[PDB]
């Protein structure tokens, strides 16, 4: 499990503020802040479209190599600001990471398969948080449900993980719950 | 159907052709699936009957010197390979065409050469 850094160009922000931020967003750019253990924050602006393509390809936790005026920097997408309505990316928080470093990351969980036809599958956790090497974080985690009978609970302990990644959250976290399929009359009392 | 599937079909057709002593190219327009099942019943014991795309066989024909069969691919294409012997499928196709009357014998390939209708009819008599 090895991931290659994604190449993006960054420009140091001449001016910071809300006016500057709105102008930059209008110019097809996204503002961001790069900070890390080095105790040295930098205010940058990125190309929105390239950044969005990178996120589409490699999820919300993607390793990045940034070209700050000819200097290559390794960074991780620590946080995002997505507008609720327009669903843009208003701001990015990037975390400075070096090779062979352990970081805490929230990785999404998706399910596949076909359980017993008389059952309904519900997902209670969108993501679980994991300790992993900076370049070795997994794109996503999968849980397979098939032949699952009646009330069966899948917890964070039972989920499978790649090699070299450690799960931090308590295994008691109910991720997926398989329940008996609600009957036709069962839908009429909920919400009444 | 993917282009990778087209390449796989080309490879499979080439592999089947390499093990076949002869082949017969015929026309099948106007035949029900019951008729094709009867033809398979007769041929499936020893020979092989297939129908494939014209250009897919054309690319699959570039392997050996059967590249001259391309002019027989204008119209419906039905291939008959002879895994057992060489001419049992020849009589099988000829009798099937005579009985059904909807089959036209485009030609055959034997001994490294492509032969026409009368030539194939003469060869089947051998």
């Amino acid at each position: 499990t090895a991931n290659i850094p994604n190449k993006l160009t960054a420009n140091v922000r001449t001016r910071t503020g809300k006016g500057a931020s709105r102008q930059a967003r209008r110019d097809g750019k996204v503002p961001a802040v790069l900070y890390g253990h080095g105790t040295d924050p930098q205010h940058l602006e990125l190309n929105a479209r390239d950044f969005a393509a990178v996120l589409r390809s490699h999820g919300t936790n993607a390793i990045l190599t940034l070209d700050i005026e000819g200097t290559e920097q390794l960074a991780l997408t620590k946080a995002l600001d997505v507008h609720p309505i327009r669903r843009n990316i208003q701001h990015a928080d990037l975390l400075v990471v070096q090779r062979g470093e352990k970081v805490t990351v929230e990785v999404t969980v998706l399910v596949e398969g076909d359980a017993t036809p008389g059952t309904l599958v519900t997902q209670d956790a969108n993501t679980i948080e994991i300790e992993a090497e900076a370049l070795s974080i997994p794109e996503q985690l999968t849980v397979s449900v098939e032949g699952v009978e009646a009330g069966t609970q899948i917890t964070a302990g039972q989920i499978s993980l790649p090699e070299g990644v450690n799960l931090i959250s308590d295994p008691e976290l109910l991720v997926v719950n398989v329940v008996e399929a609600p009957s036709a009359e069962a839908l009429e009392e909920e919400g009444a | 159907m993917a282009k990778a599937d087209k390449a796989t079909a080309v490879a499979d057709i080439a592999e089947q052709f390499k093990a076949s002593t002869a082949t017969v190219v015929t026309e099948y327009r106007g035949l029900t699936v019951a008729n094709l099942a009867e033809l398979r019943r007769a041929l499936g014991d020893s020979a092989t009957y297939t129908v494939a795309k014209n250009t897919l066989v054309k690319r699959a024909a570039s392997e050996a010197g059967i590249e001259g069969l391309d002019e027989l691919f204008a119209g419906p294409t039905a291939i008959a390979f002879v895994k057992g012997e060489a001419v049992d499928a020849a009589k099988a196709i000829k009798k099937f065409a005579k009985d059904n009357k909807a089959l036209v014998i485009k030609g055959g390939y034997m001994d490294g050469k492509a032969l026409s209708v009368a030539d194939v009819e003469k060869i089947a008599d051998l």
């Binding site: 996120l55 309505i85 399929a181 609600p182 839908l187 | -």
Partner: protein, 136 residues
């Protein structure tokens, strides 16, 4: 009919329409959801009608979550009454809905019927609404 069991004050000012939603802006329970685009009071009976519509279209499987609860009351004076003499009695319950709020959530196997049922729901609401999913 969703009615709160009890409210501390039975006569309240109108919930304010300013701003856009801050919380509950993303689907969290089910696979699919209805996101609002307009500011409105949504009553309990509109919620009931929309819920019944989803249930009838979906029939057996799947589960429906309602993230909105009508706990804010609105009052009216009795008919043909001149202005004055105190506030009227409260007689319908509403929920303050801002754009970006996710109202309903649905969990059902297939895409098409889920979208259709949600659309049947939106056709029962006094707002512009759209359908959203778990994925970004």
């Amino acid at each position: 009919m969703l009615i709160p069991r009890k409210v501390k004050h039975r006569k309240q000012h109108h919930p304010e329409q300013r701003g856009i939603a801050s919380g509950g802006t993303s689907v969290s329970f089910g696979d699919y959801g209805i996101q609002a685009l307009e500011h409105a009071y949504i009553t309990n009976r509109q919620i009931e009608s929309a819920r019944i519509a989803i249930n009838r279209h979906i029939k057996r499987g799947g589960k429906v979550w309602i993230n909105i609860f009508p706990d804010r009351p609105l009052t009216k004076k009795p008919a043909e009454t001149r202005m004055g003499s105190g506030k009227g009695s409260p007689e319908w319950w509403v929920a303050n809905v801002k754009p970006g709020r996710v109202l309903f959530e649905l969990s059902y196997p297939d895409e098409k019927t889920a979208r259709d049922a949600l659309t049947r729901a939106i056709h029962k609401l006094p707002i512009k609404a759209r359908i959203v999913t778990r994925e970004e």
